[PDB]
Design a protein around this motif. Structure first.
Motif, PDB file in Angstrom:
ATOM      1  N   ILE A  12       0.834  -1.209   0.000  1.00 20.63           N
ATOM      2  CA  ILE A  12       0.000   0.000   0.000  1.00 20.63           C
ATOM      3  C   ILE A  12       0.853   1.237   0.000  1.00 20.63           C
ATOM      4  CG2 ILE A  12      -2.245   0.804   0.808  1.00 20.63           C
ATOM      5  CD1 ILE A  12      -0.761  -0.818   3.424  1.00 20.63           C
ATOM      6  N   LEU A  13       2.112   1.067   0.411  1.00 19.90           N
ATOM      7  CA  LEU A  13       3.000   2.155   0.554  1.00 19.90           C
ATOM      8  C   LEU A  13       3.744   2.483  -0.713  1.00 19.90           C
ATOM      9  CD1 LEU A  13       2.175   0.796   3.296  1.00 19.90           C
ATOM     10  CD2 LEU A  13       3.973   2.342   4.281  1.00 19.90           C
ATOM     11  N   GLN A  14       3.684   1.542  -1.685  1.00 24.41           N
ATOM     12  CA  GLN A  14       4.194   1.773  -3.055  1.00 24.41           C
ATOM     13  C   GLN A  14       3.094   2.507  -3.812  1.00 24.41           C
ATOM     14  OE1 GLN A  14       6.482  -1.166  -5.416  1.00 24.41           O
ATOM     15  NE2 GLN A  14       6.528  -2.546  -3.617  1.00 24.41           N
ATOM     16  N   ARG A  15       1.920   2.710  -3.109  1.00 25.60           N
ATOM     17  CA  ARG A  15       0.747   3.389  -3.633  1.00 25.60           C
ATOM     18  C   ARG A  15       0.695   4.804  -3.175  1.00 25.60           C
ATOM     19  NH1 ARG A  15      -3.572  -0.706  -6.111  1.00 25.60           N
ATOM     20  NH2 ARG A  15      -2.095  -2.543  -6.262  1.00 25.60           N
ATOM     21  N   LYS A  16       1.826   5.232  -2.605  1.00 27.97           N
ATOM     22  CA  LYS A  16       2.033   6.603  -2.175  1.00 27.97           C
ATOM     23  C   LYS A  16       2.695   7.284  -3.340  1.00 27.97           C
ATOM     24  CE  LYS A  16       2.441   5.951   2.891  1.00 27.97           C
ATOM     25  NZ  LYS A  16       2.182   7.337   3.378  1.00 27.97           N
ATOM     26  N   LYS A  17       1.820   7.495  -4.316  1.00 28.76           N
ATOM     27  CA  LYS A  17       2.139   8.042  -5.613  1.00 28.76           C
ATOM     28  C   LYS A  17       1.487   9.449  -5.739  1.00 28.76           C
ATOM     29  CE  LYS A  17       1.136   4.663  -8.837  1.00 28.76           C
ATOM     30  NZ  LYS A  17       0.274   3.602  -9.419  1.00 28.76           N
TER      31      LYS A  17
END
Length: 17
Positions: A12-17
């Motif tokens: 979910i933190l690679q979703r901090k886009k």
């Protein structure tokens, strides 16, 4: 409790886009 909670920090933190 949860070991995905480690895995959590990876999906979910690679979703901090």
């Amino acid at each position: 409790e949860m070991a995905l909670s480690k895995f959590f920090r990876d999906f979910i933190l690679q979703r901090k886009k």
